[PDB]
Design a protein around this motif. Sequence first.
Motif, PDB file in Angstrom:
ATOM      1  N   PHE A 180     -11.091 -11.608  -1.259  1.00 30.55           N
ATOM      2  CA  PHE A 180      -9.667 -11.878  -1.085  1.00 30.55           C
ATOM      3  C   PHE A 180      -8.933 -11.883  -2.419  1.00 30.55           C
ATOM      4  O   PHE A 180      -7.895 -11.227  -2.576  1.00 30.55           O
ATOM      5  CB  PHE A 180      -9.509 -13.206  -0.360  1.00 30.55           C
ATOM      6  CG  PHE A 180      -8.106 -13.666  -0.225  1.00 30.55           C
ATOM      7  CD1 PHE A 180      -7.237 -13.037   0.639  1.00 30.55           C
ATOM      8  CD2 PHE A 180      -7.665 -14.769  -0.930  1.00 30.55           C
ATOM      9  CE1 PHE A 180      -5.938 -13.479   0.775  1.00 30.55           C
ATOM     10  CE2 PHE A 180      -6.369 -15.218  -0.800  1.00 30.55           C
ATOM     11  CZ  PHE A 180      -5.509 -14.575   0.062  1.00 30.55           C
ATOM     12  N   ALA A 181      -9.484 -12.579  -3.409  1.00 33.43           N
ATOM     13  CA  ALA A 181      -8.886 -12.555  -4.736  1.00 33.43           C
ATOM     14  C   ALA A 181      -9.051 -11.197  -5.406  1.00 33.43           C
ATOM     15  O   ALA A 181      -8.190 -10.790  -6.196  1.00 33.43           O
ATOM     16  CB  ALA A 181      -9.494 -13.653  -5.602  1.00 33.43           C
ATOM     17  N   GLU A 182     -10.140 -10.486  -5.099  1.00 37.81           N
ATOM     18  CA  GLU A 182     -10.334  -9.141  -5.632  1.00 37.81           C
ATOM     19  C   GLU A 182      -9.277  -8.175  -5.113  1.00 37.81           C
ATOM     20  O   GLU A 182      -8.778  -7.321  -5.854  1.00 37.81           O
ATOM     21  CB  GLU A 182     -11.727  -8.647  -5.262  1.00 37.81           C
ATOM     22  CG  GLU A 182     -12.026  -7.240  -5.723  1.00 37.81           C
ATOM     23  CD  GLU A 182     -13.404  -6.786  -5.314  1.00 37.81           C
ATOM     24  OE1 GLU A 182     -14.124  -7.584  -4.680  1.00 37.81           O
ATOM     25  OE2 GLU A 182     -13.762  -5.629  -5.617  1.00 37.81           O
ATOM     26  N   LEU A 183      -8.932  -8.289  -3.835  1.00 35.73           N
ATOM     27  CA  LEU A 183      -7.851  -7.483  -3.289  1.00 35.73           C
ATOM     28  C   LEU A 183      -6.506  -7.945  -3.817  1.00 35.73           C
ATOM     29  O   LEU A 183      -5.581  -7.137  -3.942  1.00 35.73           O
ATOM     30  CB  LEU A 183      -7.890  -7.539  -1.769  1.00 35.73           C
ATOM     31  CG  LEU A 183      -9.150  -6.858  -1.238  1.00 35.73           C
ATOM     32  CD1 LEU A 183      -9.332  -7.124   0.239  1.00 35.73           C
ATOM     33  CD2 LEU A 183      -9.133  -5.368  -1.529  1.00 35.73           C
ATOM     34  N   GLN A 184      -6.384  -9.231  -4.149  1.00 32.59           N
ATOM     35  CA  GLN A 184      -5.198  -9.698  -4.853  1.00 32.59           C
ATOM     36  C   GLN A 184      -5.109  -9.171  -6.275  1.00 32.59           C
ATOM     37  O   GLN A 184      -4.018  -9.167  -6.852  1.00 32.59           O
ATOM     38  CB  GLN A 184      -5.159 -11.220  -4.873  1.00 32.59           C
ATOM     39  CG  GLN A 184      -4.744 -11.825  -3.566  1.00 32.59           C
ATOM     40  CD  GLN A 184      -4.682 -13.324  -3.635  1.00 32.59           C
ATOM     41  OE1 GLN A 184      -5.194 -13.929  -4.572  1.00 32.59           O
ATOM     42  NE2 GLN A 184      -3.989 -13.930  -2.689  1.00 32.59           N
ATOM     43  N   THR A 185      -6.226  -8.740  -6.855  1.00 32.89           N
ATOM     44  CA  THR A 185      -6.183  -8.180  -8.198  1.00 32.89           C
ATOM     45  C   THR A 185      -5.536  -6.801  -8.197  1.00 32.89           C
ATOM     46  O   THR A 185      -4.665  -6.514  -9.026  1.00 32.89           O
ATOM     47  CB  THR A 185      -7.593  -8.105  -8.772  1.00 32.89           C
ATOM     48  OG1 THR A 185      -8.190  -9.405  -8.728  1.00 32.89           O
ATOM     49  CG2 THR A 185      -7.563  -7.618 -10.201  1.00 32.89           C
ATOM     50  N   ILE A 186      -5.941  -5.939  -7.263  1.00 37.44           N
ATOM     51  CA  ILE A 186      -5.482  -4.556  -7.253  1.00 37.44           C
ATOM     52  C   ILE A 186      -4.032  -4.505  -6.799  1.00 37.44           C
ATOM     53  O   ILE A 186      -3.677  -5.029  -5.737  1.00 37.44           O
ATOM     54  CB  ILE A 186      -6.376  -3.702  -6.349  1.00 37.44           C
ATOM     55  CG1 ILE A 186      -7.812  -3.736  -6.857  1.00 37.44           C
ATOM     56  CG2 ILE A 186      -5.882  -2.273  -6.316  1.00 37.44           C
ATOM     57  CD1 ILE A 186      -8.808  -3.144  -5.894  1.00 37.44           C
ATOM     58  N   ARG A 187      -3.188  -3.872  -7.603  1.00 36.41           N
ATOM     59  CA  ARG A 187      -1.749  -3.930  -7.414  1.00 36.41           C
ATOM     60  C   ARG A 187      -1.235  -2.594  -6.909  1.00 36.41           C
ATOM     61  O   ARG A 187      -1.301  -1.587  -7.620  1.00 36.41           O
ATOM     62  CB  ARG A 187      -1.039  -4.307  -8.710  1.00 36.41           C
ATOM     63  CG  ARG A 187       0.449  -4.534  -8.527  1.00 36.41           C
ATOM     64  CD  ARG A 187       1.102  -4.987  -9.811  1.00 36.41           C
ATOM     65  NE  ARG A 187       1.094  -3.944 -10.830  1.00 36.41           N
ATOM     66  CZ  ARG A 187       0.347  -3.982 -11.928  1.00 36.41           C
ATOM     67  NH1 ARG A 187      -0.474  -5.002 -12.140  1.00 36.41           N
ATOM     68  NH2 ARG A 187       0.406  -2.991 -12.805  1.00 36.41           N
ATOM     69  N   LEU A 188      -0.728  -2.599  -5.690  1.00 35.64           N
ATOM     70  CA  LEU A 188       0.076  -1.516  -5.168  1.00 35.64           C
ATOM     71  C   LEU A 188       1.453  -1.549  -5.808  1.00 35.64           C
ATOM     72  O   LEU A 188       1.893  -2.593  -6.290  1.00 35.64           O
ATOM     73  CB  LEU A 188       0.211  -1.657  -3.660  1.00 35.64           C
ATOM     74  CG  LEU A 188      -1.070  -1.507  -2.862  1.00 35.64           C
ATOM     75  CD1 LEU A 188      -0.752  -1.783  -1.416  1.00 35.64           C
ATOM     76  CD2 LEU A 188      -1.621  -0.114  -3.048  1.00 35.64           C
ATOM     77  N   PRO A 189       2.160  -0.425  -5.832  1.00 40.51           N
ATOM     78  CA  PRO A 189       3.560  -0.466  -6.248  1.00 40.51           C
ATOM     79  C   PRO A 189       4.399  -1.190  -5.212  1.00 40.51           C
ATOM     80  O   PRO A 189       3.998  -1.369  -4.059  1.00 40.51           O
ATOM     81  CB  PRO A 189       3.945   1.009  -6.350  1.00 40.51           C
ATOM     82  CG  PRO A 189       3.012   1.693  -5.455  1.00 40.51           C
ATOM     83  CD  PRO A 189       1.726   0.956  -5.569  1.00 40.51           C
ATOM     84  N   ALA A 190       5.568  -1.636  -5.653  1.00 39.61           N
ATOM     85  CA  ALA A 190       6.462  -2.390  -4.788  1.00 39.61           C
ATOM     86  C   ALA A 190       7.037  -1.502  -3.690  1.00 39.61           C
ATOM     87  O   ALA A 190       7.246  -0.301  -3.873  1.00 39.61           O
ATOM     88  CB  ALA A 190       7.589  -3.014  -5.606  1.00 39.61           C
ATOM     89  N   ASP A 191       7.276  -2.113  -2.529  1.00 42.16           N
ATOM     90  CA  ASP A 191       7.772  -1.361  -1.386  1.00 42.16           C
ATOM     91  C   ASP A 191       9.189  -0.872  -1.612  1.00 42.16           C
ATOM     92  O   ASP A 191       9.549   0.217  -1.152  1.00 42.16           O
ATOM     93  CB  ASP A 191       7.690  -2.222  -0.134  1.00 42.16           C
ATOM     94  CG  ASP A 191       6.271  -2.578   0.205  1.00 42.16           C
ATOM     95  OD1 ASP A 191       5.374  -1.814  -0.201  1.00 42.16           O
ATOM     96  OD2 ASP A 191       6.047  -3.611   0.862  1.00 42.16           O
ATOM     97  N   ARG A 192       9.988  -1.640  -2.347  1.00 35.64           N
ATOM     98  CA  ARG A 192      11.325  -1.191  -2.681  1.00 35.64           C
ATOM     99  C   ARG A 192      11.272  -0.035  -3.666  1.00 35.64           C
ATOM    100  O   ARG A 192      12.137   0.842  -3.635  1.00 35.64           O
ATOM    101  CB  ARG A 192      12.128  -2.368  -3.236  1.00 35.64           C
ATOM    102  CG  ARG A 192      13.602  -2.134  -3.247  1.00 35.64           C
ATOM    103  CD  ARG A 192      14.095  -2.012  -1.788  1.00 35.64           C
ATOM    104  NE  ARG A 192      15.531  -1.842  -1.714  1.00 35.64           N
ATOM    105  CZ  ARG A 192      16.225  -1.567  -0.598  1.00 35.64           C
ATOM    106  NH1 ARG A 192      15.598  -1.393   0.547  1.00 35.64           N
ATOM    107  NH2 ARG A 192      17.523  -1.428  -0.646  1.00 35.64           N
ATOM    108  N   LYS A 193      10.236   0.014  -4.506  1.00 36.37           N
ATOM    109  CA  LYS A 193      10.035   1.186  -5.352  1.00 36.37           C
ATOM    110  C   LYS A 193       9.681   2.404  -4.515  1.00 36.37           C
ATOM    111  O   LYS A 193      10.089   3.526  -4.837  1.00 36.37           O
ATOM    112  CB  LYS A 193       8.948   0.918  -6.389  1.00 36.37           C
ATOM    113  CG  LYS A 193       9.283  -0.196  -7.344  1.00 36.37           C
ATOM    114  CD  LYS A 193      10.412   0.202  -8.265  1.00 36.37           C
ATOM    115  CE  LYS A 193      10.680  -0.879  -9.294  1.00 36.37           C
ATOM    116  NZ  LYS A 193      11.805  -0.490 -10.185  1.00 36.37           N
ATOM    117  N   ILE A 194       8.929   2.199  -3.433  1.00 38.46           N
ATOM    118  CA  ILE A 194       8.608   3.306  -2.545  1.00 38.46           C
ATOM    119  C   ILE A 194       9.867   3.806  -1.864  1.00 38.46           C
ATOM    120  O   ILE A 194      10.068   5.018  -1.724  1.00 38.46           O
ATOM    121  CB  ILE A 194       7.546   2.874  -1.523  1.00 38.46           C
ATOM    122  CG1 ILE A 194       6.306   2.365  -2.245  1.00 38.46           C
ATOM    123  CG2 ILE A 194       7.162   4.022  -0.636  1.00 38.46           C
ATOM    124  CD1 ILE A 194       5.671   3.385  -3.148  1.00 38.46           C
TER     125      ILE A 194
END
Lengths: 106, 106, 37, 52, 992, 104
Positions: free
Chosen positions: E801-815
């Motif tokens: 759970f914290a490992e998936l919290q590490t990996i950062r997607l771009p922001a949805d408003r940026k999309i």
Amino acid sequence: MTYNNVFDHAYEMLKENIRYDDIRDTDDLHDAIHMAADNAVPHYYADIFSVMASEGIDLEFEDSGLMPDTKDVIRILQARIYEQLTIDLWEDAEDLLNEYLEEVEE
Amino acid sequence: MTYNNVFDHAYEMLKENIRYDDIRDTDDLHDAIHMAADNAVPHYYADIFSVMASEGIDLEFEDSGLMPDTKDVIRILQARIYEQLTIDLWEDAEDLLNEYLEEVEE
Amino acid sequence: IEATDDIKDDAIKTKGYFIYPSQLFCNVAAKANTNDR
Amino acid sequence: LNADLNSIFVAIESSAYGYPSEADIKGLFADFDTTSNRLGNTVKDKNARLAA
Amino acid sequence: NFIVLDKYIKAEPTGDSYQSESDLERELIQDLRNQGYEFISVKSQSAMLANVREQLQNLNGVVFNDSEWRRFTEQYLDNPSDGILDKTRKIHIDYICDFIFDDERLENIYLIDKKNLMRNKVQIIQQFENRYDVTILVNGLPLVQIELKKRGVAIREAFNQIENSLFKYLQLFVISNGTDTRYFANTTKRDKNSFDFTMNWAKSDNTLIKDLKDFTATCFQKHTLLNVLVNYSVFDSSQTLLVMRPYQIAATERILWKIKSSFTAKNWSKPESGGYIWHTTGSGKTLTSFKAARLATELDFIDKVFFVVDRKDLDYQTMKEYQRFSPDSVNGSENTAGLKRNLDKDDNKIIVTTIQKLNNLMKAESDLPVYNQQVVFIFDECHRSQFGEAQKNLKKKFKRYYQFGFTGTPIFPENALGSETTASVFGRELHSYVITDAIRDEKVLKFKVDYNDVRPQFKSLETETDEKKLSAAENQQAFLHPMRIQEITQYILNNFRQKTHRTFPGSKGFNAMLAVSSVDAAKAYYATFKRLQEEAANKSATYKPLRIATIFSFAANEEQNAIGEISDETFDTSAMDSSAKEFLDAAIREYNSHFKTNFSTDSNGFQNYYRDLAQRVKNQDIDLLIVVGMFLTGFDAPTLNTLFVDKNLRYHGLMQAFSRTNRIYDATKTFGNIVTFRDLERSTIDAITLFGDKNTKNVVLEKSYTEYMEGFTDAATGEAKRGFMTVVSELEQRFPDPTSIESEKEKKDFVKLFGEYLRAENILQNYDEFATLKALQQIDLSDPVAVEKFKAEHYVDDEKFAELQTIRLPADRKIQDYRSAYNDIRDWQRREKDWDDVVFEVDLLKSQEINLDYILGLIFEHNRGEMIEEVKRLIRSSLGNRAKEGLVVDFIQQTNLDDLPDKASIIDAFFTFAQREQQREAEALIKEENLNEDAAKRYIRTSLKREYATENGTELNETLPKLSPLNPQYKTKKQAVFQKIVSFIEKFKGVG
Amino acid sequence: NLARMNMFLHNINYDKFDIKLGNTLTEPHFRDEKPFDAIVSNPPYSVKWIGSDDPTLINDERFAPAGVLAPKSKADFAFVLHALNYLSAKGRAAIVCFPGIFYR
């Protein structure tokens, strides 16, 4: 083997009769029509059926008394051909009242 | 537009009736013959005359009682077609007494 | 095309204009190859 | 000739009607056998039909 | 000697530069001169005719005068009215002219010597006189037309770049650019159905041959070109010239070579003589068997050619074989005297029969005259239900035969159950065309086998390899434990709209299947859905439910074959017990209760129920279909991409089971999601082992999740892909983030990157972990209710759970920002018209549409003027909605949220306001240009019902005001009004 | 051709007003557009077609609610099975047939 083939034969034969007999009375002209009429009708089975499947002539009647009250079917069909040809020779008589008899004056 | 075209239609339709009804009594087979017979005859003028100018069928009769005593000519011709087809379906009945009913055994 | 002055036309087609009735009618023959001509 | 069943081609018999109607010596009564013809729609169908 | 080559030495230029069309043309002409094609120069139609005359005089041995040649040209060869189809029929049917010489004899002018191909003479020309073309004359007649293209031009557009008399004779158009090579068949069609049919020449192991050099070295051999063009092209009736794909021509010449080289050995009727072709199911298998049988007849020593099938296909191929009339393969019924009449009805000796009719022929008759002739059997659809004893009877009561078989279901010594293999019945695997090649041909799509490893309680049972215990564990414990069914069903109802691309309401989506093992399982499955849809409705009442049905009859009848296939299921509703019949009737009543039908549970109602059920899946009525055995072989749909499995699918019943998904639809659908719930990956590897090497699973199935996340180098094509997170880093670290794109190179590089982003995203959406990683962007933090529900859905321990919290997607408003920028680039470069270099991605951006419903939902739920900016960029995120920007803004710049009481009423309030302004703007567009008022009103409402406009349909020009049909007119106010009205109809597209 | 000019002479416009060549039974189009509001017909007598079926269209898209399918010489009642396909709930069909139906 149209109806019009038989009508052309009757037209030619009526021209022969009027041209070679010099008939100028309309009752004798119609007797010559009766001469040419049965002398122009066909005789074979398939020829009469191919004429009856053609234009101009219709299965319907002008006088039912021309039908012989008998079981001879192609006699009735040939009577129908005779009847349509007598009508068309009324028209041909109207043509030949003024077609050929006027030129022959010498 | 032969006579044999109409006979092929009647042959096919009689095969349909016997194949899909499984009729093995000859009187009911001939009732199915009466079913197929008028259901195979043509209806148009020129088609009936082109069949009557063809082979096989003849103007002559097998029973004059099938003629309606009336002035309806193509009714009489269609009755003649019906009559020749009933004879040819006697022959077809002799064929189909041994053609199809023997194979169907499972 | 008269919709107005000359019945008898001529080869004056100016074929940038020619696509407009080809969209409008799509029987666009000529001006000198009609039945009157 | 009818030992050559379904043998390409037709015109052999058209040759085999060519010469036996020549026979010009004497007093012919030939010039005769010219009713066999070609129709037919396609030449293979013509070959098959004349073989039939 | 063959024409579909086994061994080919891959040749290569130096170069001799490989770029310009002059280079390709000169090198091609030089190579064809090296292969023995004579090059000539012709500057007129008449010299073409003179060449034709010379070649025909050389071949036929006749001599014309100008009278005979004029009569032959004007009468047969160059009749002016005769179009393309007439010439093609003359090449394939009327290739002989009966001709009367002037010395009164009749001979046969050939055109194409179809029984000794070497005697034909070939020539080559170029055109006179833009394009660079190579035409190939056969005996002076032009048949083959090679076109050449600019190397930058993609072939799909290169196809769209399309006196005289003899150039109506053309058969093959070969199009190429030096890299790709396709070949048509007689100038059929255009872009709308373009590369459905444009084949590629290949070697015998289905590996494509694409460049012009090897295509010239392999396809343009004189023997191969003439043999393909004449002896393997069907002019069917009509408007149809069919050229066979090269895997078919392969199998045909293998068949004829094996016959022609077995007859010399005189080695009939023994299992080394025959052999078998194994095709995939559904690739056009009729034409292969047709041409094989038809060329099997026209060997001289071969007498009779039988063409046997299984029940009850006989009338259908009796049509399809007769699609090129007339092979006389007639068998209405087994009149045994009529059948031996057909044996004696000579000269056309191809016979379509069932295995039952031949079976009863061997049963009833025993001493037929045909049993000592030269007999060739060709079989099809050899599933073992009607095949066993008839082979023994054929080995007994025959004396000389060659038997060949086509199949889709082979049998191997890897298989078992006391049966007998195909090779010990038929012989050599002659040639085969497996699903791996069709994957490589881009005709079907790849798989994705997933094991849902989520239940530690039953993990021992769902991974047991003992098939004895796989059978033995059938109870209410090992597979029909209620929590097992519930957690599987909960997984289905939580990830159905995720797998089937239905994460958005305005999206189209797909629909799935569900294969189970037994009927007694399937009843519990359907009842479990019936309960849990109610329980899901009892939580929010906003959840859109799903339409679910079922079908099953009867039975696992016999063992009947080897491992291991779907049981052939019949239609006897009276064959089941009371319980399953009762359940089936109750399901059909619930079905009729919504679909308003009267399908019963007799034979006929069940039959019609099946025949409708196969129709309603095909147009997305039903979203999930519980299945025991049906729809697993014969069913075929382009919008079914998902198969859920709880079944022991084995060797090549497994392949048919997986093959029901991956039929191609567009750029959106990419591969087929197989979601399993038992141990099937080892079964998958062992099944694809039956095809070939261990490079196969690198081609067939799919790469792993991490390899699409990161980047790789493909061992299948030598590319070096960039993965996902690299593309995400390239988004930020190459751009003035996000909306500062002004120069030309900025725009071009942004499009070139972001299309790759959209494509990678669409590949990712099928996965599990990317779904979790998108779910992490929407969570409340902390709120351990939400985190516990999160970990309940996605089964994640806190380290992961914290490992998936590490990996950062771009922001949805940026999309939103980059999607709006891409859409603005698309709309700015739609007008006029350097930009015509890269195709924009459309079909991805055709999805993720919001059809104002989620817009009005956000407008209703927002509390609290300040929101008018947000929709102002939400409306720039969806193409086709740019005109309704001002509409919705003026809806919220006029009325307040206090004017609407709730969410469901503001919808019709918006439609009412829209029609009220629609009337005024229509009156404005009429008043502004003084039109024909009722006529233009009819035009506007017709265009709204038709949802666009056009210059076609002159009633628009009947709304021209007073005088504009005339040639001395601007016709420019016309186009201005046309722009006004297309602006208007886009401004109200969908409201009315 | 004479039909396509027959509706061309009567000032009907260009875009929509078409006839497709081919058999209606074997190659119908349009399937998609639409269940219509009004169909009229006059099927000719004796327009037979080989069945029953010669293809696998016993399990076709439109003749499945008939149960059985029409043989060769009685092809007229094929048209009525085609008729209820391309017709909405609002639509009505005005077709003509031979009188001689007892139960056939």
